[PDB]
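COMPLEX REQUEST
Ligand: CTU
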Amino acid sequence: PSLLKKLLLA
Amino acid sequence: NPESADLRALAKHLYDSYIKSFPLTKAKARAILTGKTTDKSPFVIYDMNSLMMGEDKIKEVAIRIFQGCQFRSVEAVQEITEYAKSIPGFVNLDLNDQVTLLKYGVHEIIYTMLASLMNKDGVLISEGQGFMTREFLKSLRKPFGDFMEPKFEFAVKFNALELDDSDLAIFIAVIILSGDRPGLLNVKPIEDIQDNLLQALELQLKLNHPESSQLFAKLLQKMTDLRQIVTEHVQLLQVIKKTETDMSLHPLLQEIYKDLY
Ligand SMILES: C/C(=C1/c2ccc(Cc3c(C4CC4)nc4c(Cl)cccn34)cc2COc2cc(F)ccc21)c1noc(=O)[nH]1
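STATUS: Structure written out below.
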C-alpha cells in the first residue's frame, strides 16, 4: 500500500 | 536557438513552483545564517548541556539525534512530491515510474537543500530555529562522529558555486527526472523531459552566472557527488541496524528505504 502513490495522486 | 524563450518560461515556471513547494529557500536560510532577518536568532546546540537546553525543539544520544531527523525528512518528501508534480510531463509518466523517481531521488534533493542550511560552522535545524555546530556533530560516538564531516565539505564546495533559488529549482528538476533509477519501466519519456530541463539549466547558468566558467559541468559533477553521499547515508542505517534492532522508522521512510537492503 504505497504512501508515495497517495502523495502523487492528491 | 528557437527554444531559448520557452526554456526561460520553463525556468520561471520551476522557480515559481519551487517557491510554492519549499518554505525554507536558500535566500531565507542565508538571511538567518547572516542575521539579515527580523526573525529571532536561532538556538545553538554545541554540547550535551545545550542539546538538553534545546530539547523542546527537536536511547543513546547519537541515535536519538539521528532518529530526530525523520520528521524533517517526512516533510521534505511531501514538499519534493508537490514540486515533482509541477514539472511539465511528470504527472503524465507511468505512476509506478513517478514512485521510482521519488524513491531514488528524495535523499539527493534533501542533501542538496541541506547544503543551503549549512556553513563551515554548522547546520540550520527545526525549520531554521536551531543551529547545531559541526564541532558537536564531530563529537558523537563512531560511526556518527565521522558521518556529517564529508556532508559539511560537500556543502562548502557546493555553496562556493553561489547558486540561487532560480538555479536550484532547475537543478532539482534535473535530478528528479533521472532515467537510470533502478526498475524504471519507460526510460525514454523521462530522458526526454530531463534533456529539455538540462537545456533550461544550461541557459539559466549562462545568463545568471555569465563569468562562472564551466558552471554547468561542475553542477553535473555535484549530481555524481550527491549519489555517493546517499550511498553513505544508507550504509550508516545498515551498520547501526546490525546492533540496534528495535529502531522506529516512519512508514513513508520505510517505503523509500525498502530494497536498498
Ligand atoms: C532514519 C534516519 C537516519 C538518519 C538521519 C539523519 C542522517 C544525516 C543527517 C541529515 C540528512 C539530510 C538527512 N541532516 C542531518 C542533521 Cl541536520 C543533523 C544530523 C544528521 N543529519 C542520516 C541518517 C541515516 O542513518 C541513521 C542511523 C541511525 F542509527 C538512526 C537514524 C538514521 C533518517 N532520518 O531521515 C532520513 O532521511 N533518514
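REMARKS: The CA atoms of residues 1 and 7 of chain A lie 12 Å apart. The radius of gyration of chain A is 5 Å.
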